[PDB]
Amino acid sequence: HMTSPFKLPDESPSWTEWRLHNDETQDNPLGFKESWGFGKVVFKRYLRYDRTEASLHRVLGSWTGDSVNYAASRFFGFDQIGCTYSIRFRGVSITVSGGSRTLQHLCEMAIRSKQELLQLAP
């Protein structure tokens, strides 16, 4: 059991939920997808998000610089490894990537990117 960078569990919808949602509403998805990759290993989350302030606060807590550092440092060696954060919401994907020496900075840009994309004007 690899140690995840995430602090909240996955919330991917079932096929039937997604169909039901589709019938009743995408610029109004159930939520967004995000991932963190360290070398060859990728951890992924689908998280529900409804464009409210409470919901934004909840999903911004899915990972921290500390949680990312803990998970990522399991994979660090003599060489630097590639680290990548990606997020997709409403047709737009943002990826923030670089080497493990730069991880703190990557996390700073990743969290700013997530915040901006989740708040992008309707």
Added chain:
Amino acid sequence: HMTSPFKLPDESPSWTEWRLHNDETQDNPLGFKESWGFGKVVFKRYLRYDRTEASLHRVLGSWTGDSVNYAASRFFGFDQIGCTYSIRFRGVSITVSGGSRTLQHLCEMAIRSKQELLQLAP
């Protein structure tokens, strides 16, 4: 001559400039690299940037939503095409990508990303 999305010309350093700069100083590069891709076509810029407010203002002008739309629309067909903005500065790369229907939104996230990365704390 394809029409560029950029409003400022490329400023890539020569091999000798870069060596000279290296001898006299990277978290202090000569500048940053950015690119816009529409389907198979990629336009690139190296731009000098010295972490001042005047310099930030100058390089934020290298493209606009209008200039991107003009260049990109040359390539639009019945299907949507993939559009991608990338920027690299001080070891961190950000890419903002999606389909041509979402281009306006891509440009909004791209310009916010560029601003944040170019201002990321020393």
Added chain:
RNA sequence: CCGCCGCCGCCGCCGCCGCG
């Protein structure tokens, strides 16, 4: 970390596929 070359592994986008 200026440009280019190819080689490795991973990732993202677009379009398509055919399953659940």
Added chain:
RNA sequence: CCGCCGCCGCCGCCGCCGCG
């Protein structure tokens, strides 16, 4: 646009290469 499958083309990151 939930998950998965492969197919297309482009892109980004890490490491390596060998030129300028």
